[PDB]
């Protein structure tokens, strides 16, 4: 059959739909995912045919109302859950008159969207085919879609609703442990860590008696869906020379350049986090795409910095459980940071609860098994 | 578990490999896939992690006669494949220890090559972890493996051994009504179409009123192509020329018809009428899996009789060196494009593909290998 799959507009949203995608692909499906124009490559470079919803990067959505006028993030965390929904859904309600030709012209059975890719139920309600969601992390969006719902008002209007439909399937990649009580029942699915790919080298595979850390933007790609930064970096490099800390670093090329230098000690570049996370001690990153579910699938301890009201609550049911350190706005200074590295890096009760979420994570239902739902999906449909 | 693919030195070694090794990743394995350096970027592109085998191309690895001139290929069937046998076994024992000093430190639990992907057993006998070998096409390897048995002869004594041991696990995607009566059991499986991707482009899905032909070859690549597409332009055909940039834009201005770029074979090939594939490189598998029809124009003795076989299957016409007229491509071409039996075989045989058992289900059988290795 044939399968449109719809990400978003930063590369964690293909990299967490890939594996479902591929799979699907490898299963003999006629498989396309759509995306923004900057996030092509990103698609093709997964293995997948690539579609634009829109021209238009994330950034534009993000800062731009409707009605082209600058909006400002709010700083509440009821106001941010819900402007993320809405920058979202104005991408979408954008994205749907050119997504609407496309389907019509390439005849899906079945369309799978990530959680806020909100083209793809409108593109469901229109042309009658079933709409699976597929969660691309353990985010909850329970603040999130109301945000959608009154934004795609003209839209939703049009079809006579006031808020988006359930999906016809969920699929949600959380870990039931840390999966919220309120959540919609779903078809578990393992989350597996993918991302673009490059010639090995030595050290992405080969340990020695250091003590591995990666400090980690997550895509290399200089706008993801959530900010990161990275001042903080030059003072804990000296915290962690002192412990002979093997401490690599993957960030943007610009950022990656600028830090050569203000830390010399360190590996700077970039390299995928699937291919390196295993086989380090401890992961430090900012909480966003899919890195907190690439770290426990790897069993790995992480300290989380999520930026961005939404990323703050999952960060926490991480360290709470045990796995991770979350420093919260306001908990991140120069000596928490090193604090958190050294307890991470010294206390084996993280690896251990780590360890223990990655159990819980291969033991989930595989991608492939997913794609029998699919298959089933559509013929109850069609 | 940690598996280690290795492809070879063409794109379709990786193609072929592709499906198995990304449901693999797919399944939560960590996967690693080898190939000459110049594969890095088909490696990348299909989501796997790459890793060199060599740095030198294939055609580097064929040694010279007594007084230094490159060495002929001869023309008999069984000395050919004998040959090529050799060629690729030379390969891998060149590459053997560049390969063992990356699986030393990678540690694979398992090792997956091609047909002909000789260093994977070998890395596989030196490390004491299973080898699995999947085919990565339907051509018969019988009259192959004993030439890379008698180049490998050294490395063989070296591990104890006379000659390479059957795989722990041997996987064949040929679909069971084109393998040899003779055939070896194998744990089938389905040819999935694997290409490079690029973003879709309207024509890729959208039919106009000519009948679609692609052409894929695979430099008299260029003059067959060029004179092939003249001919089908005049009939009003709607042609896809698959080939290479560096002739792209040669092509191009000789035949400005022909649509002459692009191609994604599994996103294309379904779409087109009939396929014209020349020289070699190409699965006439994807073809079959498309149930399109085919022209099949081989080069290589090694590639005839499995040429032959889908023609006397009835999905195609094969036409052997020195067969190739433009009177009988002419002729091949409007027989397949309009005669019954051609389209039927061709359904029928995508029929029998798609009832083949799934990749993903294959990955399986990899981890019962590795699995039954080490705990009794």
Redesign the interface.
């Given at each position: 059959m044939r399968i449109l799959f719809v990400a978003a507009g930063s590369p964690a949203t293909v990299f967490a739909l890939?594996?479902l995608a591929?799979?699907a692909?490898?299963?003999?499906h006629?498989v396309?995912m759509a995306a923004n124009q900057d996030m092509?490559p990103v698609?093709?470079?997964?293995?997948?045919?690539?579609?634009?919803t829109t021209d238009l990067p994330i950034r534009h959505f993000i800062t731009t109302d409707r009605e082209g006028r600058p909006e400002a993030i709010p700083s509440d965390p009821v106001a941010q859950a819900r402007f993320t929904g809405r920058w979202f859904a104005r991408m979408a309600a954008s994205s749907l008159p050119r997504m609407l030709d496309f389907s019509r012209?390439?005849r899906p059975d079945l369309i799978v969207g990530g959680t806020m890719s909100y083209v793809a139920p409108l593109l469901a309600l229109h042309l009658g085919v079933p709409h699976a969601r597929q969660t691309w992390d353990a985010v909850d969006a329970d603040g999130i879609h109301p945000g959608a719902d009154a934004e795609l008002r003209p839209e939703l209007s049009e079809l006579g609703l006031e808020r988006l439909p359930a999906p016809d399937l969920f699929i949600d990649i959380c870990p039931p442990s840390l999966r919220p009580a309120n959540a919609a029942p779903a078809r578990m699915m393992?989350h597996?860590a993918?991302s673009?790919?490059?010639?090995?080298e030595?050290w992405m595979?080969?340990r020695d008696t250091r003590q591995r850390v990666l400090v980690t933007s997550g895509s290399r790609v200089a706008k993801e869906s959530y900010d990161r930064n990275f001042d903080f970096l030059r003072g804990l490099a000296k915290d962690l020379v002192r412990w002979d800390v093997e401490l690599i670093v993957a960030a943007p090329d610009t950022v990656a350049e600028a830090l050569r230098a203000e830390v010399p000690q360190a590996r700077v570049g970039w390299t995928?986090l699937d291919?390196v996370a295993?086989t380090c001690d401890l992961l430090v990153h900012h909480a966003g795409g899919v890195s907190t579910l690439t770290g426990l699938?790897a069993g790995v301890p992480q300290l989380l910095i999520p930026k961005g009201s939404v990323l703050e609550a999952p960060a926490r049911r991480v360290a709470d459980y045990g796995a991770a350190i979350a420093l919260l706005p306001g908990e991140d200074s120069t000596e928490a940071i090193a604090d958190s590295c050294q307890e991470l890096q010294a206390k084996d009760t993280y690896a251990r609860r780590a360890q223990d979420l990655s159990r819980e994570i291969?033991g989930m239902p595989?991608?492939?098994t997913v794609?029998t739902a699919l298959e089933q999906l559509a013929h109850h449909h069609h």
């Open positions: 890939a594996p591929t799979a692909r490898n299963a003999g006629q396309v092509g698609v093709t470079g997964v293995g997948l045919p690539a579609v634009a012209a390439w393992r597996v993918t673009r790919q490059c010639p090995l030595p595979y080969t995928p291919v295993p699938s291969s595989l991608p492939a794609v």
